[PDB]
Amino acid sequence: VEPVVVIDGKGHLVGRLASVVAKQLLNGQKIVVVRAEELNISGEFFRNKLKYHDFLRKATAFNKTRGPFHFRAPSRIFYKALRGMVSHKTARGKAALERLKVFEGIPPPYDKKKRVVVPQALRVLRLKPGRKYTTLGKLSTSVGWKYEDVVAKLEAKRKVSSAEYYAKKRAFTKKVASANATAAESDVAKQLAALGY
Amino acid sequence: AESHRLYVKGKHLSYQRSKRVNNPNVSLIKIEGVATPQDAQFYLGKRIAYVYRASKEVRGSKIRVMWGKVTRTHGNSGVVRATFRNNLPAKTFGASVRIFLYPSNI
Amino acid sequence: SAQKAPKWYPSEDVAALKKTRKAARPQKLRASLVPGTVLILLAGRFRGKRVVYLKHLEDNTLLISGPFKVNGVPLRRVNARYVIATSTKVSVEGVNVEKFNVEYFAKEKEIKAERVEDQKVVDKALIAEIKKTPLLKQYLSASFSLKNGDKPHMLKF
Amino acid sequence: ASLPHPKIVKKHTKKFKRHHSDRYHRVAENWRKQKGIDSVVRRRFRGNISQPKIGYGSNKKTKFLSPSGHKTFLVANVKDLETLTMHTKTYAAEIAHNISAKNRVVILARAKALGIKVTNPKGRLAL
Amino acid sequence: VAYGYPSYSTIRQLVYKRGFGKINKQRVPLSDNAIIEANLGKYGILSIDDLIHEIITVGPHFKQANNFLWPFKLSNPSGGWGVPRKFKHFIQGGSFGNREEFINKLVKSMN
Amino acid sequence: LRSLTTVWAEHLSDEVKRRFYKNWYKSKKKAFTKYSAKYAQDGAGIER
RNA sequence: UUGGCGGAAAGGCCUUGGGUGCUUGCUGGCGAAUUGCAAUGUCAUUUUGCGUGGGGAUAAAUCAUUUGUAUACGACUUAGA
RNA sequence: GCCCUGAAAAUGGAUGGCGCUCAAGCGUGUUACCUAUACUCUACCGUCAGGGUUGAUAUGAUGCCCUGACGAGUAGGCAGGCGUGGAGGUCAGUGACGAAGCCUAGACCGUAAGGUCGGGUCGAACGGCCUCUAGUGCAGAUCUUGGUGGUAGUAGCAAAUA
RNA sequence: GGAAUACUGCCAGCUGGGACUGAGGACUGCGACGUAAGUCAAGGAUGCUGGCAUAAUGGUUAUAUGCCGCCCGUCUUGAAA
RNA sequence: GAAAUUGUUGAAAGGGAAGGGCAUUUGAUCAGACA
Numbered sequence A: 001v002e003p004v005v006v007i008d009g010k011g012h013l014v015g016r017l018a019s020v021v022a023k024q025l026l027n028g029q030k031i032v033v034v035r036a037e038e039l040n041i042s043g044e045f046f047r048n049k050l051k052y053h054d055f056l057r058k059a060t061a062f063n064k065t066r067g068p069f070h071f072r073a074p075s076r077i078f079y080k081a082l083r084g085m086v087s088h089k090t091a092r093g094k095a096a097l098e099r100l101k102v103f104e105g106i107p108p109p110y111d112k113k114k115r116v117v118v119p120q121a122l123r124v125l126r127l128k129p130g131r132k133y134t135t136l137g138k139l140s141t142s143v144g145w146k147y148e149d150v151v152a153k154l155e156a157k158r159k160v161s162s163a164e165y166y167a168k169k170r171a172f173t174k175k176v177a178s179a180n181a182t183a184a185e186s187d188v189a190k191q192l193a194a195l196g197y
Numbered sequence B: 001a002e003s004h005r006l007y008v009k010g011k012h013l014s015y016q017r018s019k020r021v022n023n024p025n026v027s028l029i030k031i032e033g034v035a036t037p038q039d040a041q042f043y044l045g046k047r048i049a050y051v052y053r054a055s056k057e058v059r060g061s062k063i064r065v066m067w068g069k070v071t072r073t074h075g076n077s078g079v080v081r082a083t084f085r086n087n088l089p090a091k092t093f094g095a096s097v098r099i100f101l102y103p104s105n106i
Numbered sequence C: 001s002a003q004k005a006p007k008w009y010p011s012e013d014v015a016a017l018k019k020t021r022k023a024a025r026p027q028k029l030r031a032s033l034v035p036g037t038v039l040i041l042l043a044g045r046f047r048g049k050r051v052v053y054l055k056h057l058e059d060n061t062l063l064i065s066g067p068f069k070v071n072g073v074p075l076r077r078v079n080a081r082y083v084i085a086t087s088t089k090v091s092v093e094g095v096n097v098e099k100f101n102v103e104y105f106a107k108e109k110e111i112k113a114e115r116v117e118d119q120k121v122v123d124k125a126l127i128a129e130i131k132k133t134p135l136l137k138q139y140l141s142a143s144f145s146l147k148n149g150d151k152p153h154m155l156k157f
Numbered sequence D: 001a002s003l004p005h006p007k008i009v010k011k012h013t014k015k016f017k018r019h020h021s022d023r024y025h026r027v028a029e030n031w032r033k034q035k036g037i038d039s040v041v042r043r044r045f046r047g048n049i050s051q052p053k054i055g056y057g058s059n060k061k062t063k064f065l066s067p068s069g070h071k072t073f074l075v076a077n078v079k080d081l082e083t084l085t086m087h088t089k090t091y092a093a094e095i096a097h098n099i100s101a102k103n104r105v106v107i108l109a110r111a112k113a114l115g116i117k118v119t120n121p122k123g124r125l126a127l
Numbered sequence E: 001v002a003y004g005y006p007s008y009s010t011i012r013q014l015v016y017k018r019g020f021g022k023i024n025k026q027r028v029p030l031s032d033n034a035i036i037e038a039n040l041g042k043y044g045i046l047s048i049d050d051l052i053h054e055i056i057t058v059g060p061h062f063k064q065a066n067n068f069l070w071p072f073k074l075s076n077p078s079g080g081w082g083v084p085r086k087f088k089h090f091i092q093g094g095s096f097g098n099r100e101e102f103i104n105k106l107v108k109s110m111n
Numbered sequence F: 001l002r003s004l005t006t007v008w009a010e011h012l013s014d015e016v017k018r019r020f021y022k023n024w025y026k027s028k029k030k031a032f033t034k035y036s037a038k039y040a041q042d043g044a045g046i047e048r
Numbered sequence G: 001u002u003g004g005c006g007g008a009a010a011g012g013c014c015u016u017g018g019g020u021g022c023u024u025g026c027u028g029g030c031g032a033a034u035u036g037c038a039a040u041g042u043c044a045u046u047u048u049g050c051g052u053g054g055g056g057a058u059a060a061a062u063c064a065u066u067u068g069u070a071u072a073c074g075a076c077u078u079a080g081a
Numbered sequence H: 001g002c003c004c005u006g007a008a009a010a011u012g013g014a015u016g017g018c019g020c021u022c023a024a025g026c027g028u029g030u031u032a033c034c035u036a037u038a039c040u041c042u043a044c045c046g047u048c049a050g051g052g053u054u055g056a057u058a059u060g061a062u063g064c065c066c067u068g069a070c071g072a073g074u075a076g077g078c079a080g081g082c083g084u085g086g087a088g089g090u091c092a093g094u095g096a097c098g099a100a101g102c103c104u105a106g107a108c109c110g111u112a113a114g115g116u117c118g119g120g121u122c123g124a125a126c127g128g129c130c131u132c133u134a135g136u137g138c139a140g141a142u143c144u145u146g147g148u149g150g151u152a153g154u155a156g157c158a159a160a161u162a
Numbered sequence I: 001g002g003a004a005u006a007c008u009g010c011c012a013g014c015u016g017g018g019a020c021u022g023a024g025g026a027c028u029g030c031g032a033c034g035u036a037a038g039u040c041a042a043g044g045a046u047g048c049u050g051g052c053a054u055a056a057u058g059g060u061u062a063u064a065u066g067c068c069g070c071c072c073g074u075c076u077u078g079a080a081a
Numbered sequence J: 001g002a003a004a005u006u007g008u009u010g011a012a013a014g015g016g017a018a019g020g021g022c023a024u025u026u027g028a029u030c031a032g033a034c035a
Ligand SMILES: [Mg+2]
Pocket: A025, A026, A027, A028, A092, A095, A096, B093, B094
């Protein structure tokens, strides 16, 4: 029902999240994806490390510039797993890729909107308890992404600013719940309780 | 009131198609809020109109409307087929199409 | 001659129509249409207006009368399929509509004085029934509109 | 006003173009049957051009009929037009391309008095 | 092929709805009862129920009643074929073979 | 990295003014003339 | 209009003060009609152009000439009121 | 049973790709659902077969009309038609107030071969039908003849002292 | 000891919503509903009503979009080669 | 005074070919039917 859906990346998978976004991008919905450094991959860390160096050695022999580009950014690795799920070579696929904005961390334009999760894409509702996981931010640093420290510094900065907003919000909803103390004993609340409200 | 919507908003998904063979005469309209084919039985026979715009004054109105209706259900997730008078131009995939409530049953 | 004339020259007389077997049967309306039902209009100039039902006409149309004081809907025909019927009943026992028919709404500018005086007679015995129950005059003046999160296959109307 | 007739369906409203007609200027646009051994038209693969055959025929009720409802007939002079006196609602007059301007004013003045429709009244107007 | 044991209901659903009789060279529907009388009146059959009586109760003149009926042009079943693999035997979970009384569910779906 | 503020000096020499132009003989030598209006005030826009 | 905060693409958020429109929190008066039994019945949004009214600003680049730290040609790199 | 070792090849790579790991994997069931020029029904064209119909005033009895089944296809066979050169007959055909030809993202008819019309150019013979005749229908035969492009304003216009 | 229900099967039981189709063109045939005059869903559509009468539907053509489509001819068991 | 080829003007499109088929939009253009 929202015009722009903001999906948090923390605690989600890759292939089960890119599939439930690339279908929604072909439906006319705009989806932005933030905090991609906390995205998780099933399996242990060294296996998902071997499945990237097996792809890192895949390039065009006579000119490595024209070969497959090997991106280190976790926001772009997730975009690589999503552009394979969209027919990007057609004009319809080029319009679905303009509907997305995948970021690293939570940007100051997209920090005051409510983020959602996809319950068929969490790392905990799909995996068995006792299986090994792989953080995409820890994977990208080990293969050549240089921007883990500049994000976690700024990620710890917004959490100080988001805790001051929530401490104001929980002190305000308490005043709303205390203003509903006079809503009792009235004849209007005894008529809304009989209509399901 | 702030709202004046007397229709149900919906998205055009695709045509009726195979892996490669497509049928442009029958489209696929997703209804928001419908996830079962038992809930898609109410929208059977409702007139679907696609409101778009243009630049030529043909009636003193840039807005041009193509018409259609509901034939049957599709799949299990609540996808609703729709045949149109003139077919949708295949660029309007994922475009908001209007689904009215008339002819009503209630 | 640039073209040779034909040989058969088929007949110019048109064939008469065969005797079709199709009779004029009375319409069986659905069970949600009783006289005195608040009707939600879907299309037309008065779309979304909650309005009072009186009587089924002859040419498959329904009487939409008023109240013209409440929401400004005059004596007007409507189609049966273009109307969502609710489950709220109002009295119709004091309504003097007997003469309103197909010839009354037939086309022949200016509003006829017969259309003005017949509106106030019908709307006199209806508003006196509306004021008996609370919040029904406020219910008919307001228009209907689907909000966000509404599912019309789930609604009861 | 012609005779009553049902809705005319042509079943193929498109002119048949030959395979490789717009690629080579030596090949005309007239449909000629491709009789090769490796043709993608004779074997009827998907996505290629369609072949004209007997299934594309029009209804005999709606055959040789203009969208006005009448049939065409080439008219050279007045004597070739007076035969269509009792058949104004079925056939329509058509003045030939090699008719002079002194005779087109005679034919149109005769078919107007007989009720015979002329399909080309705008031919050679001195304006 | 797949053959079965039909009941009286599924035979009745075929003679009335898909019932076609072959007169001299033409596939003729059984719309009128005097048509059957004009062809099988020598054997005593003069109604469409006299054809059905020869089917379920196989009398001495079953061959002339069976040769008169055109082969029933059945459609695809409405609720599908059931099992996804057709070309195995019905005992192994397929379609063909000597299916029993369950044919009565399958004929009405195809009709 | 991203540059967001570059603060220049007030009275620059004619050497880097010649660097910023390709034709010093046709130019009106009007580089950093409106930038010198920033140093003409008290200095609220300078220390900002 | 006052006071701050926000630089990860901040371009937004919060707050003081007066002025003004509306208030369906409750109770009235009047108007709607004929778009004639439905026809999205047009109410958003993007860029540009030509006219009015008001404030503000008053330059460069290339060619040619010239230098060789440059040079196949272009480029690059210098100089000249 | 599954998994592991056994298990080493050369451009970068292939469960088709993305990717998945209480799997969208493997094994086994249950229903729901997606779609072929296939099936069932209906319209229309055509073919074949079985039939109805010379009675007069008003015209194809190689006709009209009804009913049923069927329709793929190279080599090849047969039938119905289209177009061109020329000849007999005929419409007392068309035309110097404009014939033939040519041009035409203008219109119409026929399933098609093609026919017709409007506009522009043009300057003089030409067409419909019933028949007869034939050095009569072209995309490619390293086809012939004639003309013109890409390459391309490129290779190059540098021995013999100026 | 007495019932209910599940499963399977039957109804020439009733009934709601949706889609496609309207081919035929005087009557004839076969049946139904009635004491009868007659009527009917009975060998294939009519009845009523509205808008427009114009490029609006539609035709041609250009372009865009979804999907499909590897240059023919020939020799060949096999040609996009 | 046709075609190949080519000039100017006008219209349209162009992310490593072009061209085609089915369907529709938009743009250009056009017949017929109406009294
Ligand atoms: Mg889309």
